[PDB]
PDB file of C-alpha atoms and ligand atoms in Angstrom:
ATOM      1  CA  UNK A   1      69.439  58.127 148.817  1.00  0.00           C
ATOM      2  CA  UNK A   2      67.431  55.172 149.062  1.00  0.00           C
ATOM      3  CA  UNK A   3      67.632  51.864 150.754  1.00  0.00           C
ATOM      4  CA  UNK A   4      71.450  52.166 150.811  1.00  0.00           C
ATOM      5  CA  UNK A   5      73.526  54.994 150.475  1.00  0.00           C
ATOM      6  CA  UNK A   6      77.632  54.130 150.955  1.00  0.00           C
ATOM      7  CA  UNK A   7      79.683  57.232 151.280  1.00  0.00           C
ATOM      8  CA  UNK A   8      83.335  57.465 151.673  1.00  0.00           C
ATOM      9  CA  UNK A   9      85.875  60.755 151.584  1.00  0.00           C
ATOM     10  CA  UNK A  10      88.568  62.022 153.014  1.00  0.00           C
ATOM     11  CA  UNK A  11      87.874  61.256 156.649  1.00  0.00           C
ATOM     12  CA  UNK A  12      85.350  58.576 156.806  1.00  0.00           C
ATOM     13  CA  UNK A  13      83.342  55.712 155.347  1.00  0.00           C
ATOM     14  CA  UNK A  14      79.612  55.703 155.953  1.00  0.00           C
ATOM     15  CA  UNK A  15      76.694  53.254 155.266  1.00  0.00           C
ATOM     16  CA  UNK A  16      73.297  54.496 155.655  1.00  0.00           C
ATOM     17  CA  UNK A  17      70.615  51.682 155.213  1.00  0.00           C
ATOM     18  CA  UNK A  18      66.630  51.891 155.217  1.00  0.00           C
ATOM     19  CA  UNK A  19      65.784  49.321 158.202  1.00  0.00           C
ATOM     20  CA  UNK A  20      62.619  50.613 159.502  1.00  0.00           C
ATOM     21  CA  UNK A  21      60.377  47.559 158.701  1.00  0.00           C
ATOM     22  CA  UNK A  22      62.946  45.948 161.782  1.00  0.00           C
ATOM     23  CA  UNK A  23      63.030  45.943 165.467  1.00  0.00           C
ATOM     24  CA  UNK A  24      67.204  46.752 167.132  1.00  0.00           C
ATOM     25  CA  UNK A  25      67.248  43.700 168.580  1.00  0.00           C
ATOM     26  CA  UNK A  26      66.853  42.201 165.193  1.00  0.00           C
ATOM     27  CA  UNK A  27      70.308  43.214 164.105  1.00  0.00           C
ATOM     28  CA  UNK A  28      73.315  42.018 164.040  1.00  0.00           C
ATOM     29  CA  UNK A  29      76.747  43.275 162.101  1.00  0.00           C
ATOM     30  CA  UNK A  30      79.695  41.663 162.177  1.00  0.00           C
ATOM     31  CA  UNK A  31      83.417  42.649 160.388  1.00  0.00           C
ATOM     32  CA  UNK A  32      85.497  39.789 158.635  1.00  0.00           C
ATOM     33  CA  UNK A  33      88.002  39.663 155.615  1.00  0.00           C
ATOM     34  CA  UNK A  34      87.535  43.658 155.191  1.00  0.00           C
ATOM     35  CA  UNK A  35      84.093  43.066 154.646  1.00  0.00           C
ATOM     36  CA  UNK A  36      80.961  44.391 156.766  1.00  0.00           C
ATOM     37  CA  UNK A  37      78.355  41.962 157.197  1.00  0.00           C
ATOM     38  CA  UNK A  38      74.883  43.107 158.103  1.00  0.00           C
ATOM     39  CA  UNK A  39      71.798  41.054 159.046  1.00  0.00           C
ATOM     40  CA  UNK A  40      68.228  41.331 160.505  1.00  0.00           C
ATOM     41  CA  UNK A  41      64.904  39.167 160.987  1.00  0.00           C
ATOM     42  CA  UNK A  42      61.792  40.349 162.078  1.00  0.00           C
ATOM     43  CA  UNK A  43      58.676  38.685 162.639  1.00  0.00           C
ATOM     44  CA  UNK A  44      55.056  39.226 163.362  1.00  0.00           C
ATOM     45  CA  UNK A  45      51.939  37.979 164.014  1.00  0.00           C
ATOM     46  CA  UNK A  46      48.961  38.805 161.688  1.00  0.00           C
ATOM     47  CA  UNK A  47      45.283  38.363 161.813  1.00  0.00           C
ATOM     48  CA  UNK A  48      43.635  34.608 161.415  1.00  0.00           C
ATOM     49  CA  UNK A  49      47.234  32.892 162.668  1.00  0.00           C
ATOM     50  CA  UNK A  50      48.910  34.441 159.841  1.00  0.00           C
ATOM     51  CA  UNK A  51      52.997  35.511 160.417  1.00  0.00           C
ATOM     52  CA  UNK A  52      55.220  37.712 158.509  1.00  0.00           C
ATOM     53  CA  UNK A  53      58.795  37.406 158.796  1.00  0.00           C
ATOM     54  CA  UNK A  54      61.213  39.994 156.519  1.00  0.00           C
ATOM     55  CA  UNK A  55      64.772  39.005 156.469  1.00  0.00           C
ATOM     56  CA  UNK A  56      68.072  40.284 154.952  1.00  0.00           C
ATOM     57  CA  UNK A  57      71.424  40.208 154.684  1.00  0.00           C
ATOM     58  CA  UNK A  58      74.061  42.931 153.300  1.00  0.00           C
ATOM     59  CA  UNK A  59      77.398  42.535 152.629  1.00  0.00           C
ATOM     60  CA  UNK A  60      79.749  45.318 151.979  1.00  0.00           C
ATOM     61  CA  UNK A  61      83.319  46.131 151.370  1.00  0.00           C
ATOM     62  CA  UNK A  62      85.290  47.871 153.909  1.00  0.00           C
ATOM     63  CA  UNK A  63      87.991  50.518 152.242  1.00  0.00           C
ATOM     64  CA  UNK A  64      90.897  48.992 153.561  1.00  0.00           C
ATOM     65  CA  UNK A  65      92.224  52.271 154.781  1.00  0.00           C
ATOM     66  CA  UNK A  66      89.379  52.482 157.287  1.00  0.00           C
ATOM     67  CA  UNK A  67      90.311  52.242 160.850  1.00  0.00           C
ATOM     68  CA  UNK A  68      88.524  48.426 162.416  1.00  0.00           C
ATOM     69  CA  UNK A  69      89.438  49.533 165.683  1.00  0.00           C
ATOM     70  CA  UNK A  70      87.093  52.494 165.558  1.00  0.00           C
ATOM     71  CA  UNK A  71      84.196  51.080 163.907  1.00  0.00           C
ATOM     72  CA  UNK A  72      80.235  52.442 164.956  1.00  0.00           C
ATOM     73  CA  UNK A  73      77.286  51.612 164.217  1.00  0.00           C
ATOM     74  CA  UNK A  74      73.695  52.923 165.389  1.00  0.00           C
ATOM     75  CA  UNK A  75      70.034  52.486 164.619  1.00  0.00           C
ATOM     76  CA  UNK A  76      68.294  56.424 164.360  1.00  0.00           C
ATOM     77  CA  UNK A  77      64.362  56.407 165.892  1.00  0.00           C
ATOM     78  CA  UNK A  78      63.260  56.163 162.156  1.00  0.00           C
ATOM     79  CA  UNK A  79      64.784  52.893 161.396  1.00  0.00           C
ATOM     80  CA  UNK A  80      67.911  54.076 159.801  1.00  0.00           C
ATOM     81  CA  UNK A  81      71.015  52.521 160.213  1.00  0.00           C
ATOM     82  CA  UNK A  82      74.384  53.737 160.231  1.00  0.00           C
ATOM     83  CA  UNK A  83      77.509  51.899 159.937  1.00  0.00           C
ATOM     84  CA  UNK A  84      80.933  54.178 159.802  1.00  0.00           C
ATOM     85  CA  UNK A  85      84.788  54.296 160.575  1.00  0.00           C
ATOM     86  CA  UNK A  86      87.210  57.599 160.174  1.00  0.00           C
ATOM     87  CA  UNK A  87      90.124  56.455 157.837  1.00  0.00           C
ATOM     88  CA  UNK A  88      93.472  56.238 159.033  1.00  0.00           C
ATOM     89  CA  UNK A  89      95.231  59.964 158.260  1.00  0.00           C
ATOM     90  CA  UNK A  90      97.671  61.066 156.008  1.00  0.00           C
ATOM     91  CA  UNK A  91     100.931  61.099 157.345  1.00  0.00           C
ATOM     92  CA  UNK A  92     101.640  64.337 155.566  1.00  0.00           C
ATOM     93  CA  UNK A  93     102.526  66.921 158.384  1.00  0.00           C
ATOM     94  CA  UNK A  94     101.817  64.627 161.087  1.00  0.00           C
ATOM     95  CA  UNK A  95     103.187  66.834 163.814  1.00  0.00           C
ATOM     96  CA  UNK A  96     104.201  69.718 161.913  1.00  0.00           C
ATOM     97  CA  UNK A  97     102.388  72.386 164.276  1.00  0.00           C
ATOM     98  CA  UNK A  98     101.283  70.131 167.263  1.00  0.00           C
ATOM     99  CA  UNK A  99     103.149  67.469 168.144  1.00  0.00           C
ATOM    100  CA  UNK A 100     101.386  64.362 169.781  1.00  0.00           C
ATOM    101  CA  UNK A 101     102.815  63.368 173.431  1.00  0.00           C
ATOM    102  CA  UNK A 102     102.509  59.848 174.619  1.00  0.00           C
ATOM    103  CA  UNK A 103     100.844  59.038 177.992  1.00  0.00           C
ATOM    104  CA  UNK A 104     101.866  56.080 179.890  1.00  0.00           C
ATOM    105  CA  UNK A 105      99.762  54.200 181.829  1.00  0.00           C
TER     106      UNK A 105
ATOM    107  CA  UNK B   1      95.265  81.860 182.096  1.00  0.00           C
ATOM    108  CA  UNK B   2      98.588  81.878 183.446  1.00  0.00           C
ATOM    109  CA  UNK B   3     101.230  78.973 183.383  1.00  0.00           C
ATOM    110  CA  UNK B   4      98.949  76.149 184.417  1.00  0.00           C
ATOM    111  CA  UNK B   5      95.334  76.661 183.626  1.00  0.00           C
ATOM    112  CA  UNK B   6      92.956  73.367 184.773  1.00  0.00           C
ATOM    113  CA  UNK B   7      89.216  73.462 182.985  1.00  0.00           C
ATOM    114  CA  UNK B   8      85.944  70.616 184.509  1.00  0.00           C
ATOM    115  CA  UNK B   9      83.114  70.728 182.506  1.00  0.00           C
ATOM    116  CA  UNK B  10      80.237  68.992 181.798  1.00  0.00           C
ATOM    117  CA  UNK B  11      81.939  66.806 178.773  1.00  0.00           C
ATOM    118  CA  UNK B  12      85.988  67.141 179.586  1.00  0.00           C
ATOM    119  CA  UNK B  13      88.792  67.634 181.455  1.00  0.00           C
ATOM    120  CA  UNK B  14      91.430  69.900 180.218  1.00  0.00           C
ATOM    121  CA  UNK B  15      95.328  70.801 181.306  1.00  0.00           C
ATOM    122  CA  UNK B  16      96.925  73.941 179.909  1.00  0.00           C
ATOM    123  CA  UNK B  17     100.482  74.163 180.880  1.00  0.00           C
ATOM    124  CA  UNK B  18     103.063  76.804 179.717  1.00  0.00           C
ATOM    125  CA  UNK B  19     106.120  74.838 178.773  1.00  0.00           C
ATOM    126  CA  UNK B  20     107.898  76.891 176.151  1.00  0.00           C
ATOM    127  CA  UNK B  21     111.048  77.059 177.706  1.00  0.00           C
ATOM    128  CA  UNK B  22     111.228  72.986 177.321  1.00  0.00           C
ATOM    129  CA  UNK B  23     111.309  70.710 174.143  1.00  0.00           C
ATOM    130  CA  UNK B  24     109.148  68.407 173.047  1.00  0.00           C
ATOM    131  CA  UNK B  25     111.176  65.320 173.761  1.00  0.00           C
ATOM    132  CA  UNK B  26     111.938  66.801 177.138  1.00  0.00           C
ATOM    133  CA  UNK B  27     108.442  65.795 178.530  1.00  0.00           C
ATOM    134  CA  UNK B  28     107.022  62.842 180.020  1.00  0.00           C
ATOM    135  CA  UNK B  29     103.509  62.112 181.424  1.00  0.00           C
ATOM    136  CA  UNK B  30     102.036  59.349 183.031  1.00  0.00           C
ATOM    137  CA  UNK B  31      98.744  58.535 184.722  1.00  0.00           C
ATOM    138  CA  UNK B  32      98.885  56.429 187.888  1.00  0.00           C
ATOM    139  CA  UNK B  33      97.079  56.450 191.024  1.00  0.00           C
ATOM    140  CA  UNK B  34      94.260  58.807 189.029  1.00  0.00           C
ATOM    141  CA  UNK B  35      96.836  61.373 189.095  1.00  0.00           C
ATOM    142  CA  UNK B  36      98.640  62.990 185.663  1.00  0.00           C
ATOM    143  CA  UNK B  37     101.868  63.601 186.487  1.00  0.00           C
ATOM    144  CA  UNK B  38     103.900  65.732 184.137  1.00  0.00           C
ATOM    145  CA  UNK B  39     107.816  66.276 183.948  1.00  0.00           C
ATOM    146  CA  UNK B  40     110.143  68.443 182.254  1.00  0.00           C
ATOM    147  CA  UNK B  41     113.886  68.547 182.336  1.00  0.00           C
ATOM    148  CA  UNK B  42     115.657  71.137 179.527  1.00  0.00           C
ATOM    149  CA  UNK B  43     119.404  71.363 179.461  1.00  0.00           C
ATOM    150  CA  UNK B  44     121.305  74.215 177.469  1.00  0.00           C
ATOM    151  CA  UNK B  45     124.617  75.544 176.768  1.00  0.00           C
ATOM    152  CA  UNK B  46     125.504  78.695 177.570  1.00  0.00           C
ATOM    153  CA  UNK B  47     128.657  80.980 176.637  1.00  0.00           C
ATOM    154  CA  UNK B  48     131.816  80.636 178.486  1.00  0.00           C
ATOM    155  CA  UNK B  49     131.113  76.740 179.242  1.00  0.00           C
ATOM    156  CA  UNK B  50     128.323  77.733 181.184  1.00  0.00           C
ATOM    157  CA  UNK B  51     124.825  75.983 181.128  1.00  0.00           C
ATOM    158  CA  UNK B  52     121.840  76.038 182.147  1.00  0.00           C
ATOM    159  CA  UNK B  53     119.253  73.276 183.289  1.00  0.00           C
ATOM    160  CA  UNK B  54     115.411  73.792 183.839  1.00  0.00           C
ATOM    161  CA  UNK B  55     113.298  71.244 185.137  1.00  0.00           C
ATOM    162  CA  UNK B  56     109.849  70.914 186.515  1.00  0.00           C
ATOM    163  CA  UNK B  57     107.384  68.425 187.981  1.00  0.00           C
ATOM    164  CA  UNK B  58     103.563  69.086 188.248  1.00  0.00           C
ATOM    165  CA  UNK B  59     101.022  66.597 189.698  1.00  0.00           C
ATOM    166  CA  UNK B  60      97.620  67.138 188.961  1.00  0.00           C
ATOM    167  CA  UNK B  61      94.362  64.959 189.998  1.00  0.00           C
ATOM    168  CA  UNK B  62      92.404  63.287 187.463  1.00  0.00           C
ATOM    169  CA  UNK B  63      88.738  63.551 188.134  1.00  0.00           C
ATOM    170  CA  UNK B  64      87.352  60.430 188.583  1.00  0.00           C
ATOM    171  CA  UNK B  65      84.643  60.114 185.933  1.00  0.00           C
ATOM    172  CA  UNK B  66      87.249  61.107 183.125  1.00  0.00           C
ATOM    173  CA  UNK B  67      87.769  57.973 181.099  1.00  0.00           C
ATOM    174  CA  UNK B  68      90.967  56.966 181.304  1.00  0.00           C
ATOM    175  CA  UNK B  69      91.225  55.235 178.127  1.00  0.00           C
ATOM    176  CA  UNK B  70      90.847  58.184 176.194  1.00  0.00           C
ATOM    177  CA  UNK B  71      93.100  60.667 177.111  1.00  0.00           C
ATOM    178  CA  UNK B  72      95.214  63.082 174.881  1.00  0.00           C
ATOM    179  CA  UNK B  73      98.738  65.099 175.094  1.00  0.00           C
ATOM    180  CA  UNK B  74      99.611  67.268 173.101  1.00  0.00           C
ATOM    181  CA  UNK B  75     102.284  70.090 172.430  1.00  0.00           C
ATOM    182  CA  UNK B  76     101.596  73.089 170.429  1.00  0.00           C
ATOM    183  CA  UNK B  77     103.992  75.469 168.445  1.00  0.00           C
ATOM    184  CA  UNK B  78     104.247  78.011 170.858  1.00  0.00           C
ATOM    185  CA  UNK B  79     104.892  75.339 173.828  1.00  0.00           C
ATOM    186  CA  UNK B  80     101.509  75.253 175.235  1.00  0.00           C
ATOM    187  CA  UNK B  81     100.819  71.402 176.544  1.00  0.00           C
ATOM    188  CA  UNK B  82      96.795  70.317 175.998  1.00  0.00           C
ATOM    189  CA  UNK B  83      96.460  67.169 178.423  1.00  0.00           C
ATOM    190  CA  UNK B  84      92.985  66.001 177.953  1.00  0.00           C
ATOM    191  CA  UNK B  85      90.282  63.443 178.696  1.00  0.00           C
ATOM    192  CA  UNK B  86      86.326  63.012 178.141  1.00  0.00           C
ATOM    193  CA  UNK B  87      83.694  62.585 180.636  1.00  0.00           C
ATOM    194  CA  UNK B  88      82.174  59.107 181.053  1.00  0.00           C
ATOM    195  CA  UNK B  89      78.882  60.370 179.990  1.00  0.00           C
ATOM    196  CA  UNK B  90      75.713  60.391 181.797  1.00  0.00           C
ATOM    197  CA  UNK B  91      73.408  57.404 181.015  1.00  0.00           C
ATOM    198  CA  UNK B  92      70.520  59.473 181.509  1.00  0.00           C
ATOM    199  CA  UNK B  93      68.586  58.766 178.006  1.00  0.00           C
ATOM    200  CA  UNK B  94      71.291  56.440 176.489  1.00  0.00           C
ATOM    201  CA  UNK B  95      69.818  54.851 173.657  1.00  0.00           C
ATOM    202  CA  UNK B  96      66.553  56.913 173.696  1.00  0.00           C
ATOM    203  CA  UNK B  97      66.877  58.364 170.261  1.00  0.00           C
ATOM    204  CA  UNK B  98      69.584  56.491 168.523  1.00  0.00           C
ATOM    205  CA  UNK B  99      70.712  53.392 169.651  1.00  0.00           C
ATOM    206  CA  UNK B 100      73.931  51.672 169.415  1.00  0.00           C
ATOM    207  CA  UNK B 101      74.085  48.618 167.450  1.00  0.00           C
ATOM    208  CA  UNK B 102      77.320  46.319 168.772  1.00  0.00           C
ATOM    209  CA  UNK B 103      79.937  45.820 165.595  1.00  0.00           C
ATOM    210  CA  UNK B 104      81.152  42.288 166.513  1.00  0.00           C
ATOM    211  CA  UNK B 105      84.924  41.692 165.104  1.00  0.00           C
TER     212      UNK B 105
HETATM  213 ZN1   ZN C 201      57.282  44.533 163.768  1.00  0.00          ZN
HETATM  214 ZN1   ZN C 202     116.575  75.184 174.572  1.00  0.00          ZN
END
């Protein structure tokens, strides 16, 4: 859905964004004040001493029902990135037909 | 597959233990010394000022690529217990499609 796509439901929020003029290493994303913060530089030589360099940066909200502790993010072998986090359930019938057991450690 | 049923696969390890005689709060488990060890004690009154107690311990080795930091318990309607726990995977090919991208915080 073009450069950026942001998709959140039920169970998840999702960012898909168009990076493929970028290198991984050229990356970075950081998470602060419920906010996703995502950067890249890339440079490259060109003929007769000529550079290019392409920069960004993209700041997004984070829903603030997404779980931070569980927080991915990959880069696909087409130059797509994609930043997401499940959202914390529902309590509704939490336990109603299995019931969580803790393990101690 | 009987009361105690142990699955090893490629991606998991799995514990299926037949506890319907017992209630939920009646269970412990705890992981030390990379085993799982799982108790049970279920106390009932019976007529005449009888009662009844039923208790079990089972000890059961953790294999030791299962990732300790993610494992599961759970207890299902009928009394079934589901103690599980991934696979550390294999880092054959890590990274060679998709690659992770860290998320600092
Ligand atoms: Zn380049
Ligand atoms: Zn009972």
């Amino acid at each position: 859905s073009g450069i950026s796509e942001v998709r959140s439901d039920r169970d998840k929020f999702v960012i898909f964004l168009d990076v493929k003029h970028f290198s991984p290493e050229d990356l970075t994303v950081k998470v602060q004040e419920d906010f996703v913060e995502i950067h890249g530089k890339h440079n490259e030589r060109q003929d007769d001493h000529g550079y290019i360099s392409r920069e960004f940066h993209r700041r997004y909200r984070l829903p603030s029902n997404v779980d931070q502790s569980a927080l991915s993010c990959s880069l696909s072998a087409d130059g797509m990135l994609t930043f997401s986090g499940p959202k914390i359930p529902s309590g509704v019938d939490a336990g109603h037909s299995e019931r969580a057991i803790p393990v101690s450690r």
